[PDB]
Symmetry: C4
Subunit: 310 residues, 4 copies
Amino acid sequence: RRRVLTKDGRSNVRMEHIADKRFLYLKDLWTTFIDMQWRYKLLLFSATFAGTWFLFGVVWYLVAVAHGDLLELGPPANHTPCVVQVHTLTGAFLFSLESQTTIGYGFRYISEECPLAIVLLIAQLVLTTILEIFITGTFLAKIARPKKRAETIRFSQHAVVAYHNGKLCLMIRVANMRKSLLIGCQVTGKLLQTHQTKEGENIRLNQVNVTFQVDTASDSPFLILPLTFYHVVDETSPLKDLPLRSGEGDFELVLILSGTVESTSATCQVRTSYLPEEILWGYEFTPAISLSASGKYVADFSLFDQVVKV
Amino acid sequence: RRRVLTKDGRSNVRMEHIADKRFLYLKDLWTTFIDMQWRYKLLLFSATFAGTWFLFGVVWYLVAVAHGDLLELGPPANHTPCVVQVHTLTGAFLFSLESQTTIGYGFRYISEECPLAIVLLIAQLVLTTILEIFITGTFLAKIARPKKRAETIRFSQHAVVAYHNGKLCLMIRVANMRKSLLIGCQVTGKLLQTHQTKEGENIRLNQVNVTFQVDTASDSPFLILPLTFYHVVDETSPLKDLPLRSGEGDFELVLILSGTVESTSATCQVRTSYLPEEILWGYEFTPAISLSASGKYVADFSLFDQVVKV
Amino acid sequence: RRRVLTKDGRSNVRMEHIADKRFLYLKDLWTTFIDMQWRYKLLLFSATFAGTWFLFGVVWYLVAVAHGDLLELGPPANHTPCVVQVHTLTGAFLFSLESQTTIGYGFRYISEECPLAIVLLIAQLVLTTILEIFITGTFLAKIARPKKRAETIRFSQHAVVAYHNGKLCLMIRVANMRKSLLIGCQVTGKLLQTHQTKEGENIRLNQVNVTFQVDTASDSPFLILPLTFYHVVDETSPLKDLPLRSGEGDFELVLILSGTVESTSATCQVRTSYLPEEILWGYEFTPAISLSASGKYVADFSLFDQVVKV
Amino acid sequence: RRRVLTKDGRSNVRMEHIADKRFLYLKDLWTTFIDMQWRYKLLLFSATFAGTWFLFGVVWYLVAVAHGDLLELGPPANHTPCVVQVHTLTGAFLFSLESQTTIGYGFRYISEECPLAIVLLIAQLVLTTILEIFITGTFLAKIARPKKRAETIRFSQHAVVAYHNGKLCLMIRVANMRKSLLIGCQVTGKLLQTHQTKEGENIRLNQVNVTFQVDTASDSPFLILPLTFYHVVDETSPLKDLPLRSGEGDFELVLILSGTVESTSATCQVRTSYLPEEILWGYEFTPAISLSASGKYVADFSLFDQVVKV
């Protein structure tokens, strides 16, 4: 069906008819390259390097021409070229490359004759350094993004409603698949209904906070183990008036876990959604924790999504 | 007219008569270079590189002189130079460059004769490495700045007053022009009046928080779509006593959206201002959302700033 | 005995029976390499470098072969090789190395004859640059991790119960072993009981927040000196009903200090645990602060863990 | 006199008699090098580079020896050295350098004869790369530290007590000397009294939060202009019972401004202290703001510290 967020936590919206998109993106190149697709990004990386090499090699060839350094034109035995062993396009490209990369073999080098060549070399080095820097930065930042970390954090496929501590409550379970920890883990539940004006020329979405609690409805400093979050269906519950029967209703329950990563001090936001159908009644999650002669606690993730009727 | 903040969210204040500005800036070079203008920054980049090359080349020339390595002075056939193929200023500059860049062609190299030359080379490499590092850092940081990201986030040109849920309220709309998300999005409204002491030798600015709400006056975890923020004009509203008629009054309504970026974990603060004139009465924003056979929701930003009378 | 967290603040849990672990880890390589062990990490570093060198050297050797550049096969006096002075495996490896590192001696270099060689070189440089970048990033990030900073922050070995300001309270002491500061230091106490279903096929852990206070139960902006945190045993204390006698009970008191580092703006979370036995009754911590002719305050950490009966 | 914090916001405490300091510092090298003094840091930088060069050059010399490559020992005309043009200590050092820096002149290079030399070179490159990386990181991080940014933020030299809005309150003023902004600026006031046990073998410091407010006692999103913070001396004021007369009392009023930097998303904490003497009675700060034909507001910082009697 239609859903604002994918079960995977991804957006589902398409923005359109934006004016002045191109210029704006060109203003903030950093964010642009970061958000860009991987394929075009690698293309641009390789293109930067090789195309700079190629262009400046063409320029070196032209310079060799103007100075009459080519062999075809028969330079005198006392002709000093602007650049040594550069009498062909290939050689100019190789010089450009060997320079921009700081390899510096030595078979092709500069003479003290043509200053313009020196100035050109300088410009080449400076600009290429700048571009290389910028690209390397974008690449590191695009890898470091924490979105990809959200996958090793998993929400239960199904949320379940049942009596906890005598109170009818809605419950979910969350887990971390890695040894690396989260920090300041907090959960928030949003409710999104469908407000259709008599025919759907437009839609206004109503947000309603849904508080989920663990210990005191406060926070959970660390996500050590698969935890169960629960929200109370009381007189204040915006859910109270919903069709409590399974499958009935037109609403989305979005869930958001925000927490700081320990190894990078970066924030991470996992997201997901539950539909009126996906939610289940009178079911309690199977416990997925148990002791061991280890003296250590163990988490069996096959019991994570498992549930049992009440 | 006069405004503390530009519609674009930029400051409008000029600090003056600061003592010990220069020395202070010299203490914190990092922040200085980061906040500096782009042109002077590129100038300094190029200058660092080329000028270090040039100075150390001059030094190499002087060394060649003191050792009598120049051709003009007729070194014996058994004269060993401190540096090879360095008998001119140009050659010394080229040596400096080829070294500092780690190119290393080979036509110009060092001999095992003059140690001072070796020590000098060492110093050159170390210092130039340090400077290059510092500049590269400043450059990366100056690009990564999130200010430039604020442009792809847009506030409605006009705020409007009208009855929402039966309550007279002030309303604005906000949107994100990119697919990249924000996080922990919160809004705050400040009111700034004009307190003139009988003649304007001085002015004292009174701040007054204005709370804007969406769902529960709490927060908005993610900025998926163009959202509408609204503040209630009740007995506690500092606006209550203002001249509610359009155009009347001497006050600024500053708006601030604070939120964390998803791809960089950095904070971003968008800002703007509304004047007593810019605010409009009895108008409601045109809905800019609508379904599609996509199964996806769509945002038509041409309807963003659009409004309709009530 | 069994404990969720080690006295050292480390986890004690083993997650098992995870499905699709390998592919997931391969998706997020950044986090993986960061969390990986040091030995395998250095192995991978060295392997990247040397193995890329080795493979591309093998390729260069094969190319030399196909072009008949080897000496063993007797190239004519007018035979131009794709690469110079490359007639052996060793030489090909050396060429690969000298290139990928941008050393560029010069005895072994490229000719303008074989383009395929040029294209191959290009590919080599690009890929190796990318890999080097990625590894360097992971290495920097794995060092910068703040976990290792938690060691220079120390919790008292023993917590003690006694009358403070006439109120029975539980008290602990915390200190920083360095001159570098913390920021936004806040403390939280969790209580973890043992809920065994009649036999231990499963266990459900109940979290209970325990608030610790210093001045107003608010926060402590800076961790200048060894501070004492204390929690009140009142009617609301979840501890109130515990066996207050030393050694009795089956519960863990976990302690968590969260604070921001000043020099890196990164977060840090120190953790520890106290068992019913480790806790002591009617004891007050020895003061570890005292003046000095310095005019400066001094902290004697030998008095840190020291206690005195009341 | 004695003060916990310097007027400049620096600590004044000396920690002593720490056990296992050295090993701990060696565990967390990152933080150590970051917090280290500049002089020793530059020493270590230069030492890393030059000393690695020197040691590996010594090794190359020894290798040349074992292989009998030295001239002094008269190698046959058909003797192939492990390394070319390396017959002296100086030459070995130069080879080490030219390699570790990726310069690669070419007059001194490797032969395909001695593999051990190749393996040694590999080790050298790898280790030196690692060390260079680590040092560069520490250096960048030590510069980027925001402490140094606190200097361009200034607190009023004197705090003053007087009637504001009819209420006796304590007031201070704060300013930013740069165009770069702060974010989430919040202020906290701590009160520190002197608890001497009958003779000063020990001292227990009592913290008491003092709330300072601007608009609603909430926060100040941005530090645009010199702002005045004030705290109310009411029945709840811990100051209420102090000797309100100037100069009387034994207490320190510490002030802490916490805020996020806009250009780096980093936190910054400015600190200062006021003594019972420094505080002044019945004085109000001179306004340091005034209009201009600019249409812009201006801040005259010479009026910052200025005050006027009431």
